[PDB]
Amino acid sequence: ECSVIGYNAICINRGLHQVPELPAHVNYVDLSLNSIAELNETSFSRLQDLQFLKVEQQTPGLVIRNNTFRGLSSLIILKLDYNQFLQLETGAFNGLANLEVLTLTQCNLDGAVLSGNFFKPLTSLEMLVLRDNNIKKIQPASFFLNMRRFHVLDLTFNKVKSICEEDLLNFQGKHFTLLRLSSITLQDMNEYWLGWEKCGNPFKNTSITTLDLSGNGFKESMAKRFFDAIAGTKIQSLILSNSYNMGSSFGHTNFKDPDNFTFKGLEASGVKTCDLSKSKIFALLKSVFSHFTDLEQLTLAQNEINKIDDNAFWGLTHLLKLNLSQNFLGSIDSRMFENLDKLEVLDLSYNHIRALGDQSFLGLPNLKELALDTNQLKSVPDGIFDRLTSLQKIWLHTNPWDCSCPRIDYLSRWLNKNSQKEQGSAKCSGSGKPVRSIICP
Amino acid sequence: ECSVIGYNAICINRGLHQVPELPAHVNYVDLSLNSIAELNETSFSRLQDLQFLKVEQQTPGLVIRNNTFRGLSSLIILKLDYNQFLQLETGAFNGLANLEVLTLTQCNLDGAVLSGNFFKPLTSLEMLVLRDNNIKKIQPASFFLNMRRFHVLDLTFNKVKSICEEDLLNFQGKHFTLLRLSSITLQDMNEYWLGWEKCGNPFKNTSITTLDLSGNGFKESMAKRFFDAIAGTKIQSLILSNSYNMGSSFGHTNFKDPDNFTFKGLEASGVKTCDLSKSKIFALLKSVFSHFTDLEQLTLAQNEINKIDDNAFWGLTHLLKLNLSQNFLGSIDSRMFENLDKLEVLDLSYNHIRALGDQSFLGLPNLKELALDTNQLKSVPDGIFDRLTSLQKIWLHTNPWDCSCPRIDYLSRWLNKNSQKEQGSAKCSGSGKPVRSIICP
Amino acid sequence: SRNANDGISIAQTTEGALNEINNNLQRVRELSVQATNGTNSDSDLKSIQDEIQQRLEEIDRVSNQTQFNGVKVLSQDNQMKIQVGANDGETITIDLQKIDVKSLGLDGFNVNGPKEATVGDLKSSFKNVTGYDTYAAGADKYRVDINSGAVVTDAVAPDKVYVNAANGQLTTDDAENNTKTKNESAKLSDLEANNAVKGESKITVNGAEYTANATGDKITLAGKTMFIDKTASGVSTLINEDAAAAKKSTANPLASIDSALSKVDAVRSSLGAIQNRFDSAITNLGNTVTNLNSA
Amino acid sequence: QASRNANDGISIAQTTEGALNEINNNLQRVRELSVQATNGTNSDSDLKSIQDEIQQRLEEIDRVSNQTQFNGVKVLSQDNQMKIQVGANDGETITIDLQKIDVKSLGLDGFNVNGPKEATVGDLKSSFKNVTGYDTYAAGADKYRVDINSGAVVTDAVAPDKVYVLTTDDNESAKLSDLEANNAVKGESKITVNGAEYTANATGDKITLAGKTMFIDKTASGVSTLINEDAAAAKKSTANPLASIDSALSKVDAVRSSLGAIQNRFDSAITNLGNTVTNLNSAR
């Protein structure tokens, strides 16, 4: 039944009720979409060289007995996703000392899968994907301390009311390259919770390259307390996109925009990249980013930003890249980008910018790339770009440029003189021909 | 000294202290920017065929004596503007029975100029321009009832606290083609005024082609009471641009947007054209235009419109033209333009439109011209323009079109099939080439 | 693999729109938690409700606009069969569901309805509030005026109440005989000392007598619960329980949103399983291997 | 460069005219906001909302003043007399009279409508709970107190005695109508607010604490508090708000008028060079 080509046995959707006889040299087996009701020790007897095994989405109810994968010491990746009501016996992963990657997405697993001994045999485990299960409380068993190569955990879509110090005790001492806690909600961890003190620091003595906390709401008062609680945690790259509770949003003042205290807990984290896009932020308040003293990249794209207060960027001494694309900016002036002395890249595309102030880019001498495309600019002030002597690339297209002389004189000469900087080509509204081609008498 | 060419004597700025000897056949004389201190009967003795006379902006203090223009029975236009502290004797315009147009802009005239007999001789007067004087109260003298050809009056820039029934008694019976009461403020005529009852109807038994009330604030409560006061007045064309008090504006709720009562007084006015641009309107509330049953053209350009409530245009059965250009619309759906069945022209350019609903133009079968340029559209839904079979002109340019296939297929095919309709040329963002030129496989 | 690819696009389109809806529901939920647990003025509840209304409307707009190739993926319960196999047996069915405000149980969902009147809330949102509390010391019934705190008998023609100079007992006697020392005016503490039991209050508000319970938390006019309502402008008015029910704040607002949430989540899970199905059917046709690194 | 400079003279004048109009509209809106603040029924929260809009309009004025330019020249930034040469032969200069017009120069720095106001007794009882105390009166040597709220008349003594109808002798109870019948002279009031006795002049006009004039500070969220003149100084709401805006308005209007006269001057200078006739129809 299976298609065996080279080292690969594709046994997808073949009406199998058991593991078939396969050539014993295969190193890759896909047994997805069959009706295997139960795996046990006899299932994979033949297949020693096996490195990659997928047994995804069997008919609901798959049972994996003790010692099913015993003797599969070459197995590196095991995918058991979408097995609805997966039943694992506690020694189900015996023999898997060499396994690096285990995925169990949407298998109706609860927190006992972490607190029990199911993963005790997986001493070489690197990567564990437990998305979209019924894990309500993250409580790794003590053997996790001895898993020296464990560095990726994906818990996306589990409904986790809270994560606390005592929950994550057995992750202390770990460095995670990726800890993905996205759309878990953390519903309990709000400002009216009586649990904050007892919760302590869930990431005590833990460090993280990428901490993905996207899709969790992060109301300002939650973000402040959560970052107060994990203060000191080394995080290189912070992802808080779709913090749908964070901004006040345009038109309402029920929730607060983040302010100069919101991210104080990240003072000592060493954050290099921060993603705050799609979070309904409407105003950048003074000093809101002041604790991000190592920050090099900041995206605030696709928020609702209409207002940037003076000193909104105070403290961002290392900031190289600022993305404000897809926001609601109506105009720019010099105060908006004060304190961004090292900035190299500014994306202001897809706003509603109708005017640039005389000295809009004054405090951006190192700007290399400036994106002003897709706004609503009829004109720029004379000399606007003169101080930008490190500029390499500018975007100006998809704006209704008014090519009247002399209004257009400075920009057309500027674009003509700097033609290799222009990305795309700004057009006159009306005639539709290049701004750079206009010559004013 | 003067330049005489043809029938025209140009005697501008020649250091003249009197009216010079001129050839007696000239029919046009310009004596502006001289130092003529005084005009009397001997000034224009020579010049019978004279039709057009300008004596603007002499050195301050010009005196016009009794019978200055007597014998000038062919004079049609007399321009005396910018004579600071103009002194007219009361028979200054004797002999001007044939004069059609008199202009006295910025001459420091007070209301005595209208209530005295200065204009009594001007039996053929059509047009009187009294801009930018110190007329505080508009009180035409009784002889105005006998001026059968008088139909234009411009009072722009006079600080007029109020206009009331008794002020304008002597314009009753008159039809004005143009009554320009622009930037007069009408400061007293607010919602806290104790004067409304006594004020009555300033336009009693008067009808108007163009009533220009631009630049007067017209807070919603003032508009309501003013139009309640003048209820019944036939007005063909109503100009309320720069009613800087009318809208709530974007971001604030101190002032009210106009509502279903605001313009009730115009029920029976037969208004055909209404200009409400530059008035800080933020929301179009339900039935706000419902009393404008004869309305043919409506401009709401350069407001702050971000929200159009259901049935905002209810009652506009005759509306042919709607201008919503330079506003803050973020999207369009079918409910926005219900009740506009006769609409032929819709201008939505220069908004911030990021999305068109599936059926945005459903209730607009008769549309001939559609302007969507200068917005922020990446795409349109399939079939969006299909029911627009009367369409002659469409503007789509200066939008960030996404030329991905197949997202772009419908619009590119539509544009290619309907290319004579497209005004300007929609471009792909990215490549910058015409949308019409994309062919999807 | 063409139809299986379309199956994926439909599933991605629906998943994206469900996520938008989920985020709006979760924001509504947090707004509601704020309305319930925050200290919230009348004006705050209205602001919150204005935002909730706008989010509910964003849900209906997503529901109404979201489409892939004609198909309005959230508009109707629709079982889409996608043929995944050349030989005509392999169909995979996408289970599409009507998801909009009405179907999620959220029509009329609100958080700014009228609240049951309380004694505290009366004396916090009205003026000229008169009346008294009743105490009972066994057989004897007493009235304690509010604002003055004066202790009177609970009768038609009420007697002033004083405190016995020797015993501490409650009495109507001005003084006590000797062998006259004045008795001090009685106070609440004197009723408390004397073991009196708090009964019902009689609270007059804008000239209308209301009966409050001992604890002061339930107010009734002729045996019907009273709710305080506030106008847009902010004038407090007292209404009955039946004229209240129409404009009521939604009972169990959290449970209503969670219901909506789990309904949205169930379609989301289903879509995830169905995309894994499509992914496998494509890899089965191409005979494609994922690589260890790419994994 | 004869009609060339005159044309530039026109452009400068139009650029300034347009900017002045933007500024005039903002001032007139600020004026109407201020009229609403004064004559409307306005909660503490309303006055704050009004002021937030006023601040934004004042800020729009400074922006216009700072950005408006024609060919390098910031037409509203500095008092500057621009000579435009309008005649070939070098004598014809027409001078544009440009003026510094911004929030500071219009006298509107700190213009506000929500700041603390001098405290009145009316305003004390209208914004504080448990406002207690009495007015004093005097019919010659005899001295009286009248409790606000209750209207009871007592003797102005250390340990005060009830007054009756004027006698302290046990005769109906004394009230203010009996005092004015005795031609009594209203003296200073003594008013306790949140447990602090303040003193008020006869008319309720001024309120003092140890000689210091008291102001009522108002927050958006309804709570008010009392503060002294010195602490109110920098933030107190603007005296004569209408007069302040009207002052700004007529300053802006005077530049506008002048510009109108200077544009007419330029128009004539151009027609004088071209030898241009306007036509009867074109005049209509």
Ligand SMILES: *[C@@H]1O[C@H](CO)[C@@H](O[C@@H]2O[C@H](CO)[C@@H](O)[C@H](O)[C@H]2NC(C)=O)[C@H](O)[C@H]1NC(C)=O
């Ligand atoms: C967990 O805690 C330990 C002990 O405090 C950390 O190890 C120390 O780290 C410092 C640098 O900050 C070194 O100078 C010491 O030499 C280390 N101690 C020991 C005993 O080696 C450790 O790095 C922490 N782990 C994480 C992941 O944060």
Ligand SMILES: *[C@@H]1O[C@H](CO)[C@@H](O[C@@H]2O[C@H](CO)[C@@H](O)[C@H](O)[C@H]2NC(C)=O)[C@H](O)[C@H]1NC(C)=O
């Ligand atoms: C600023 O952020 C925007 C929005 O996130 C970026 O655009 C996205 O970039 C990714 C990765 O290249 C694309 O797959 C998406 O399609 C883009 N989304 C949209 C809505 O365009 C943008 O590139 C960022 N700007 C800069 C300069 O990096």
Ligand SMILES: *[C@@H]1O[C@H](CO)[C@@H](O[C@@H]2O[C@H](CO)[C@@H](O)[C@H](O)[C@H]2NC(C)=O)[C@H](O)[C@H]1NC(C)=O
């Ligand atoms: C002003 O008043 C008169 C009299 O009321 C108007 O004249 C009447 O107009 C109606 C048409 O509506 C005729 O049927 C009557 O015969 C007219 N009466 C007379 C005596 O002529 C007149 O037209 C009004 N003028 C304006 C400008 O409204």
Ligand SMILES: *[C@@H]1O[C@H](CO)[C@@H](O[C@@H]2O[C@H](CO)[C@@H](O)[C@H](O)[C@H]2NC(C)=O)[C@H](O)[C@H]1NC(C)=O
């Ligand atoms: C809608 O109104 C806009 C704004 O008034 C019109 O654009 C103006 O048209 C006038 C008169 O032709 C021009 O002199 C202005 O320069 C235009 N202003 C701007 C800001 O572009 C527009 O033409 C109207 N739309 C339609 C379809 O008539």
Ligand SMILES: *[C@@H]1O[C@H](CO)[C@@H](O)[C@H](O)[C@H]1NC(C)=O
């Ligand atoms: C292994 O699986 C098969 C099911 O096909 C079953 O018959 C057998 O009893 C199982 N063996 C053990 C040891 O559980």
Ligand SMILES: *[C@@H]1O[C@H](CO)[C@@H](O)[C@H](O)[C@H]1NC(C)=O
């Ligand atoms: C499987 O393995 C564990 C560990 O030895 C053992 O204790 C457990 O009872 C076994 N379960 C079954 C069902 O055989």
Ligand SMILES: *[C@@H]1O[C@H](CO)[C@@H](O)[C@H](O)[C@H]1NC(C)=O
């Ligand atoms: C000008 O004319 C009128 C009418 O004859 C006369 O009464 C008036 O006073 C005259 N003015 C002078 C200055 O003579």
